[PDB]
Symmetry: C5
Subunit: 103 residues, 5 copies
């Protein structure tokens, strides 16, 4: 398995690493039907989503989508610095695939 | 997908944005039958609910309703500033559809 | 729907509001069979339970019972002030139906 | 029905109360097969387990076992004072049945 | 049952104990398909994973895998010192079987 988020990200098509080294500036979450998702922003304006679960996802990803929204919420409320995000860049906002947190 | 809570709220009928930019003043939750819900207030007297799950909800919303009560609870306890709420204004108290936190 | 805990509490028989306006003094939780419950006390000696799930509860209350014990544990640990409890008083200790937190 | 941990503990055979009145010294958890358990210790050297779910546990204890591991984790991290533990003493380490937390 | 992480770790083949006595330096988690995992590192560079659930895990480990990612995230955020890790060393990064935390 990959040793880090950069190596993990490179295993997939349509991805890119974003290097933030900053806390989350805003956290949004919705329960509206067909938009059950989260959206975060950083102070520079860069915006990211956790996608609504769909036909593009395999079953194993469902629990991990729920965990990512948990992660983002707590990271936001603790002001944790996000180091990098691995995202799919074939969506807007870019869709989070993975996150790294470091000091 | 929407970039922010205002654009997401605009996708639905019978909704509005409330701009609070304030922490939650009170948090209430109930396990009583047919009243399994949360209610929050702001110091200006605005009151909102997370509805009881029912027939107006699609299955994918169920997990999201539970997550939203989770979110409000921790927002309350951490005194996190709520920026905006997207609500259905066809219910009393207005029913939460999405939340944004910033600052 | 109800706008506050007092109006909610009044929808049910065999309930009363207790006004605490205090943090929880003790939190006790059990996994022993037939006693899978939580008990909280306040420094005025008032004691309350989250009842073991049973045939008195409808299906939709199950998730909310588990949520209540999460709420009471985190309230305890954060020393959050509990404003009011809505309880069933046909049980000893009185059984929690709803909680409000403020101040 | 019990109003406190001592009374609840007394309801079961092969149990005893340990009075700690201290925070947890160490918290251990495992995901290894057939050892999906938690172990806590105190600075006096007392060691306790949350048992692996098995055929001694009825269905309704399974959820409560999960919650107890949650509770011990967060108690540990917050340095909350543990007042008493109700344990089964026919297992080594003694097996937790209930916990009370108080200042 | 085991009294500590060292005795638990010794019940399994292909395991070793790593003694860290330090907080986690970075936390990574992924929802990408077939890489639904967590990776942590320590300041000395040492890197560990929580494996993707697979056919080498029995059903009872599934829930504990979920729990371990929860634990590592909150450990990371609270800067909790990790005492020891029990890992399987037949994988790269070494795969976490158990964790102990102590100050
Ligand atoms: N696959 C796929 C897609 N498509 C995904 C589409 C993303 O769409 C979001 C656009 O929003 C839907 C706007 O809906 C109008 C539809 C008619 N539906 C409703 O009437 C309706 C009403 C609602 O309100 C009731 O329920 C609320 C609780 O949900 C609340 O109680 C309110 O008070 C009630 O009146 C709510 C909804 N809802 O959706 O939440 C809908 C794509 O791209 C793909 O590949
Ligand atoms: N769809 C829809 C609806 N319907 C929702 C409207 C409901 O509003 C709330 C009004 O509530 C019910 C008032 O209670 C009378 C119900 C008769 N049932 C009971 O007797 C009963 C008894 C209860 O107490 C027992 O259980 C408690 C635990 O639940 C506890 O153990 C206690 O000690 C017991 O005596 C409790 C309930 N209960 O509901 O909680 C009910 C609408 O509008 C739509 O559009
Ligand atoms: N509805 C309803 C009721 N009735 C509810 C009754 C309230 O009961 C409270 C006390 O319960 C029974 C005390 O147990 C004696 C009964 C026989 N049970 C056991 O043999 C037994 C043994 C246990 O120990 C084993 O399991 C432990 C884990 O559970 C541990 O591994 C230990 O080492 C083992 O020896 C444990 C239990 N258990 O219940 O936890 C029981 C009412 O009133 C209503 O409305
Ligand atoms: N009832 C009851 C019992 N019995 C309870 C048992 C006490 O058990 C602990 C003793 O442990 C036995 C360990 O099993 C070795 C047997 C062979 N099994 C395995 O081959 C095996 C291999 C494992 O490693 C692979 O999977 C790992 C993930 O789980 C990791 O990916 C690794 O890289 C892989 O090589 C792991 C396990 N596992 O069990 O975790 C087992 C009692 O008492 C009662 O009352
Ligand atoms: N057993 C076992 C294994 N198996 C584990 C393999 C480890 O592999 C990781 C490398 O991953 C596969 C790279 O995939 C390319 C192949 C085709 N797959 C895709 O088409 C694909 C596309 C995806 O993007 C869509 O879905 C995204 C959400 O998942 C997002 O919405 C994006 O916008 C969409 O385009 C995503 C995936 N996905 O897998 O996440 C795949 C081993 O080793 C053993 O021992």
């Amino acid at each position: 398995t990959p040793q880090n988020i950069t190596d993990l990200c490179a295993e997939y098509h349509n991805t890119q690493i974003h290097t933030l080294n900053d806390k989350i500036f805003s956290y949004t979450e919705s329960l509206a039907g067909k938009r059950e998702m989260a959206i975060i922003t950083f102070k520079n304006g860069a915006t990211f989503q956790v996608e609504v679960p769909g036909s593009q996802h395999i079953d194993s990803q469902k629990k991990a989508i729920e965990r990512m929204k948990d992660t983002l919420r707590i990271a936001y409320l603790t002001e944790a610095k996000v180091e990098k995000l691995c995202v799919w860049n074939n969506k807007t906002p870019h869709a989070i695939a993975a996150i790294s947190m470091a000091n």
